[PDB]
Paper text:
NiV has two membrane-anchored glycoproteins, the attachment protein (G, also known as RBP (receptor binding protein)) and fusion (F) protein, that mediate receptor binding and entry into host cells. NiV F initially exists as a homo-trimer on the viral surface, where it adopts a prefusion conformation. G/RBP binding to the cellular receptor, ephrin-B2 or -B3, triggers a conformational change in F that facilitates fusion of the viral and cellular membranes as F adopts the highly stable postfusion conformation. Here, we immunize mice with a rationally designed, prefusion-stabilized trimeric form of NiV F and identify ten antibodies that neutralize NiV in an in vitro infection assay.
Four antibodies recognize previously uncharacterized neutralization-sensitive epitopes on the lateral and basal surfaces of NiV F, located within domains 1 and 2.
Author numbering:
A (entry chain E), G (entry chain F), I (entry chain L): 1 to 27, 27A, 27B, 27C, 27D, 27E, 27F, 28 to 107
B (entry chain B), F (entry chain C), H (entry chain H): 1 to 52, 52A, 52B, 52C, 53 to 82, 82A, 82B, 82C, ...
C (entry chain A), D (entry chain D), E (entry chain G): 27 to 104, 112 to 474
The structure:
């Protein structure tokens, strides 16, 4: 089993500021043959169901705004928002879907100043 | 287009049993694998169970905490997903989500249904 | 009767269809090849290299004449009659070649009457036209080099250097000749030696021989590259040092109700892994009979497969059943490399492993998604009129077949390992398991 | 995670460790190759051999242009757009090569404006430098031979001989060319053809092309010998008889956390017999993953293995377990020949089969004796500082590992036979035994 | 102890018997090869191509000297003494070759005292005869071409063309050299490289080297064609650009009580089908021991098999039992092609499949009929003195063996498939059947 | 030289049994396969049964109409062929021929014997 | 099973006339490897046993007069008599011996005018 | 250095039993195979029994004359060799030697012990 | 099984004389792969245990004097003493250790004159 960790647990940002959060895995998520990383980023707004943001390491789901960027490789991954709006108030999760038991991360809460 | 609707939640006594149902529409149901994901009040997301399609002999997977108490099933003719839960404990009170798996990642999520054990 | 839909679902996309044609019905011509040049115009200082060259050439050429004498002494008119006790041990091909050798002897005897004219030629290519019965061509190995290099330089350099140059040229010619006409030539009676190998006695210039003899077309080049133009040695002279060669020119006949089908392999997805089917890539169909073909000995063109011999080989029942629809009997191998083909185009329709490669539709701007339960995706213009795969943007046609292709699954086969050491290890493991099972019995 | 001690005890002594590197990131250059020489200074008696040569060359060159026209007609700007219905059937490599062919067309069009200057060159290597945009090099196939041999001899010999010499030279050039540029060339769209094969249109002199284009180093020679320098035909002219070739120069990138380990096989003793382990001699390790590698397609140097593509192949679980310590799963083969290696040196330590070879210690003058129950013997300077084995006397270092190496035995594997006919016979025997076991069942 | 009657009944007709001989006991000679020509008589306009050629040649030749320095630094008198710690990793063959390299150093040092005379040679072949101790031959790569082509032309053409011609000749020589002396040469210490490969440094003219050194016979040609004449590089000069090569001339020794037997395969009839036995075609017998032989590495003449190394390989027990009479253990394969041998001649006796070929007797005018229950027919002169098979009429001898050959049947073996993909499919099918049988257990 | 002589024919009652014999001479008997061929009065030829040699494990073949009623056998020591017929019907009245198979075609024919069922 | 058909059922010829009869099979009788046709022609005179005339497609049995000729391939075969004598009054059968159950043809009766 | 000492010999009645012991020192005992060799008074040498090491599964070999009466055993912890003899006959009176096998030949010999049967 | 024979049974020799004895086997003792002969010569003095003299065909055991020489091949082997001393009074045995049952020879007694 691969253990998933997130940092920071909470972070307060102002409108228009650039923000960055990090996700780490105990083992490499890179596939041997097709060279793909099996990591996903999900967003959950208060009172709503979770929504998929990034499904590969850096591939955006349809309808996601251009300001979200996923990056990284191996065991280190990063989610970056260039300019956080007021509608980005949510909790973000990183998940690995390489193998059983497909665990989620701890989550990172975003706060607006 | 893709729609997942959960039902069957409520309040149960400890050491009881209850069955949750998920109705799917807007896509070909027998092609994809399905998941159940639960969230405790105020806590994070936790994976529960997975069922695969007919081409993979309906293989099922369960989490450690519900390995011998939960059962996941599907009905392709009615396009329905079922989770039967026995020997319920106070740690199982949560919101449950029916999840459509696309590719190998979690593609679509339902609204969720509430289970309270007391 | 190949089931192309299921084979495509398992990663075997159908390619082009080719015709099958084999050589037959040859015509014959006769040529003379001289292995010693004429040095009468530099004979002031040839030194003594010609005697040494003659001794070496005689030592090379004696065993070939000895091998031909075995069949020449024991053949006569009977309509060809052979003494089997004197020959002793032979194959059918050797006996047929001996019959052909006996048949060529009349023309060889007609040619051998021009020995004085053959010995006095001083050009690279000479036509002997005394009578129409024996109109022959003579090719001399090193005449051009002597005529154009050594003779005009006689009065310029000291001709000790000329003698050394002639010796070096002769030695280089012998070094080239020994690969073909040395002790490797164990059975000169046969007629399976190609014209390209024979041309080593003329410096490897088979174009000059073929252009002097006959004509050139596209079928001529196809015959040349399929090793269908052959020759046979019928006479060796140990005094004037020449040989007589009979050249065979066949024609290509097409075999009716026969074709060869090609399959392009594409990797497919199963259980977070990449797989390739272990199936023959070329299939021969003759009168609704399915078989293998050893295509390494044949020539593959865009529209036909050309061979000098029928190369059909048998096929197991399980492979034949797999090719006709039983996909659970088709073996597969795991992919551990990053360099494998991942999509193919057939009849304007795309077959792609979109789990491992990025597929998206340009018409709508959306990505094309494959479920983890599917092996491949078939893409045509009904769903995506124009697809982009990296740096290529391609428009698509309409698929002919089932409308529910992507909604129907397939049964998978057992994984295999094709390494030779792995084959030995698997054989040992199976034998030990069988021994244990017998021990229980 | 290879268990080197047990593998050495079974006869597999560890060798050197090499790095893994593959080609990537090529740069492009363009050259022009002319297949017909300029004979304007002997045109008094060229005869009519030039017309026949032109006819033959046109017949050779037409199918290549026909094959390129398939992709040139169906490609346009969309950023490259392709018509899949017109193409019909293709592989991924062919589509990528067609994209590259479309990309080269602008430079091809720039070069094609110098047709008059190309047609009038009379040297073997000519630089066309009209503008910096189209600074190109032109190579002519037989210009040097004509300039240095036939022209100065025009007043010395009868020039019928000059005409015959020119005809022979052209025919020899065609005979050399037909191997590469004949009907074997079925798919000219691809870019996998090496510069050495392309240089046959220039007489096989790829050194001149590479020296005129770029530079030479040790990595350049390693790239050249690994078949990483390739070229693609992008334009054919049927009136002036020249081709335009794009040459790719890649660089070698080293793959991180990967290495290749070599094993030296040594015969060992068991039950009055000699045995050799059947184990792969080259093992690829990438991120603690063990796999096979098809090393016949790669270049092996003293410090690295160089390939133009990833050649990793899967390995069975039993072989992987054998390589990690389970010696009872490693197959072995009997030795019936008298020519096998019987000792090896690793890190200054000797591993020897002293039952079959004579071992003695020079320091004490006594023989080194091996028990009949042991497979090999490990010899280092704790027991024998200097060992003599026949005509060689060698001083030894200290062994790193278990102090009780020679007091600990090993478990043996099952014998195997690796002959092809033996493989078929073993398959038949196992099938018959399985059928008998099922008959009992 | 082969049972020839039963093997003939199963389609394996005995052929000729050959002797077994291997190389041994070599004598040594030493030669000097210069890789740069003398251009002192055209030095007016050599330009600057010589400096570039020297730089490229130095880059080529440096790694070979670096590889030789590893063994030259760590070897001394002890009677040859080696430092195993400095060498580190080596095979037995490398150590033996290093001992030979140390042994050649005295003659190398004697030759190296004539460096000034070596540097001043201006002929292709030069004999240095200062003292009888160091009578040596020097071969220069391109001296003949320069002496006979470029020098006499100097006053005729502009010598910019002469410079370009010299550059092209040097580049062509390097292009030929790089195949043998490039990075493929990883281990120059060994002595397994043939004289033909070494001669690429002299333009591929090994005949000149061998004729200048020694003599030529039939055994000399057999040794040359079996790759028994080898050479070893013992000294490299990076200032005058020459090498010193030691050439080994062995003799062929005959192994007593050993022979090689050939079998000719003939198709036979069974159940309206055509079959071919899957049995090795060459069998080695040594002291009544039967084994296989890798004959692809050897040279096959009419009377003997010649190898540079013992190539005996083991054989399974089932195949050995099949060869000694147990015909039910011999595998067979179905024939689906129309091109197979259908009769053979042995000791004047014919073995023919008269079901598939037309047999008739000329003495009586009647056809020869084969029953559908028989595999082959043996035909000799007790029944048919003279047999006609198509266009051949052959008289026959008397069969030695059983008088009731055609009245006695044989037991058949199991059918097999020898295709590689078929081998993988059969392995998978057997494994699945074994798994099912274990599931019942 | 090659001679085949049939015997044992006659008139039988319906639902009876009869055995026919064939004596061979002039050739090696145990090498060849043997056949029985019957001809109804005024009609064409009809194949009945085939027996093979010892090298093919004495394999036997029968026609559809007589598959479970007829039995073909051979005796190599006496060079004899036998056809035992049970449950005879009115459709079996015919002339029977002992046939020597050469190659894969019918090589030699006997004189034949008459069976009448009434 | 392969079905054999013959044509015509009966045919009346005069002495010295050329005659021809045809046999047809539902499947090809050509062997894949040795390229032979497994078809035979038999002759039965009135009151006599059948006698083999042609055993391969075109190979005559010993003792057969030269005026009989067999020809054809695949599924079509032909028996031709160049000049019918008075002794040719018989019934002719075509048979296939490629596989089970080795059926005979219907037969063609010849009549002399 | 290498030392082999035999013990346990003596005089026994016919049809009796006796066990001989061999103590080894100076070498690693569990690496080598061991032998027993007997010599009758005034006659030549005769091989009796062989035992192999642990790597060859302790395979044992016996001579024809003592095949079903003698038993050879070893104890690697104590470095001891044992020969148990039953049904002793008058032909067994001899001197017995404990033999260390080096390579495949007999490397080292002990002093020997005397057996008399009367 | 391979039978071993020795010759002569006894031989009387004087001090300083060269002596030679022969051993014969019914089958070849030469190994196929390593080309070694599996024959040994042992010496037994009166009242002493047997001692190994030659273990391969011609290889001397450590401590053996240089005057002992073993030679031969195949089925014929020879033991030669160049100059016999008074201490060579012993019985010499030849043995084969190629295969079961590893039999000894008959023995050759040496006597001093
Ligand atoms: C492609 O375009 C060329 C140039 O117009 C034309 O000659 C040719 O017919 C077209 N089609 C093919 C298949 O080459
Ligand atoms: C070997 O000796 C030469 C000559 O002294 C020296 O240049 C070189 O560094 C030494 N070592 C090696 C590895 O060649």
């Amino acid at each position: 089993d691969i253990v998933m960790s997130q940092s920071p647990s909470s972070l307060a940002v102002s409108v228009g500021e650039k923000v960055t959060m990090s996700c780490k895995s105990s083992q490499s998520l890179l596939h041997v043959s097709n060279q793909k990383n099996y990591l996903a980023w999900y967003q959950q707004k208060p009172g709503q169901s979770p929504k998929l943001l990034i499904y590969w390491a850096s591939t955006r789901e349809s309808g996601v705004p251009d300001r979200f960027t996923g990056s990284g490789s191996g065991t280190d991954f990063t989610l970056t928002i260039s300019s956080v709006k007021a509608e980005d108030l949510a909790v973000y999760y990183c998940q690995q879907y390489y193998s059983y038991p497909w665990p989620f991360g701890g989550g990172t809460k975003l706060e607006i100043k | 287009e893709v729609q997942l609707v959960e039902s069957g939640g409520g309040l149960v006594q400890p050491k009881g049993s209850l069955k949750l149902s998920c109705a799917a529409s807007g896509f070909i149901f027998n092609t994809y694998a399905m998941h159940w994901v639960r969230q405790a009040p105020g806590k994070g997301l936790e994976w529960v169970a997975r069922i695969r399609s007919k081409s993979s002999n309906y293989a099922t997977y369960y989490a450690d905490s519900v390995k011998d108490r939960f059962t996941i099933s599907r009905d392709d003719s009615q396009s329905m997903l079922y989770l039967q839960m026995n020997n319920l404990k106070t740690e199982d009170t949560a919101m449950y989500y029916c999840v459509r798996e696309g590719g190998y990642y979690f593609d679509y999520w339902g609204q969720g249904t509430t289970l309270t054990v007391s | 009767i190949l089931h192309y839909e299921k084979l495509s679902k398992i990663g075997l996309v159908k390619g082009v269809t080719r015709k099958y044609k084999i050589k037959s019905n040859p015509l014959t011509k006769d040529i003379v090849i001289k292995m010693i040049p004429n040095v009468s115009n530099m004979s002031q200082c040839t030194g003594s290299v010609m005697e040494n060259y003659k001794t070496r050439l005689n030592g090379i050429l004696t065993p070939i004449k000895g091998a031909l004498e075995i069949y020449k002494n024991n053949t006569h008119d009977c309509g060809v009659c052979m003494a089997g006790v004197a020959i002793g041990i032979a194959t059918a091909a050797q006996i047929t070649a001996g019959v052909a050798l006996y048949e060529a002897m009349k023309n060889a005897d007609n040619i051998n009457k021009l020995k004085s004219s053959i010995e006095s030629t001083n050009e690279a290519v000479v036509k002997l036209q005394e009578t129409a019965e024996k109109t022959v061509y003579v090719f001399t190995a090193l005449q051009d080099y002597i005529n154009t290099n050594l003779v005009p330089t006689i009065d310029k350099i000291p001709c000790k250097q000329t003698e050394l140059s002639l010796d070096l040229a002769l030695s280089k010619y012998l070094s080239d000749l020994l690969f073909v006409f040395g002790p490797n030539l164990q059975d000169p009676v046969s007629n399976s030696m190609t014209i390209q190998a024979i041309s080593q006695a003329f410096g490897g210039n088979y174009e000059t021989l073929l252009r002097t003899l006959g004509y050139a077309t596209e079928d001529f080049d196809d015959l040349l590259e399929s090793d269908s133009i052959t020759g046979q040695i019928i006479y060796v002279d140990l005094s004037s040092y020449y040989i007589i060669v009979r050249v065979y020119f066949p024609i290509l006949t097409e075999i009716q109700q026969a074709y060869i089908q090609e399959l392009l392999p594409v990797s497919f997805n199963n259980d977070n892994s990449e797989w390739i089917s272990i199936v023959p890539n070329f299939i021969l169909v003759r009168n609704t009979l399915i078989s293998n073909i050893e295509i390494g000995f044949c020539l593959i063109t865009k529209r036909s497969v050309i061979c000098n011999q029928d190369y059909a080989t048998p096929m197991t029942n399980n492979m034949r059943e797999c090719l006709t629809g039983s996909t659970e009997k088709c073996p597969r191998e795991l992919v551990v490399s990053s360099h494998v083909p991942r999509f193919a185009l057939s009849n304007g329709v795309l077959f792609a492993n979109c789990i491992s490669v990025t597929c998206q539709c340009q018409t709508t701007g959306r990505a094309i998604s494959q479920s983890g339960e599917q092996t491949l995706l078939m893409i045509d213009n009904t769903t995506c009129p124009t697809a982009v795969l990296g740096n290529v943007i391609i428009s698509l046609g309409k698929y002919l077949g089932s409308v529910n292709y992507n909604s129907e699954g397939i049964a998978i086969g057992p994984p295999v390992f094709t390494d030779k050491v792995d084959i030995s290890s698997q054989i040992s493991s199976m034998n030990q398991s069988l021994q244990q099972s017998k021990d229980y019995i």
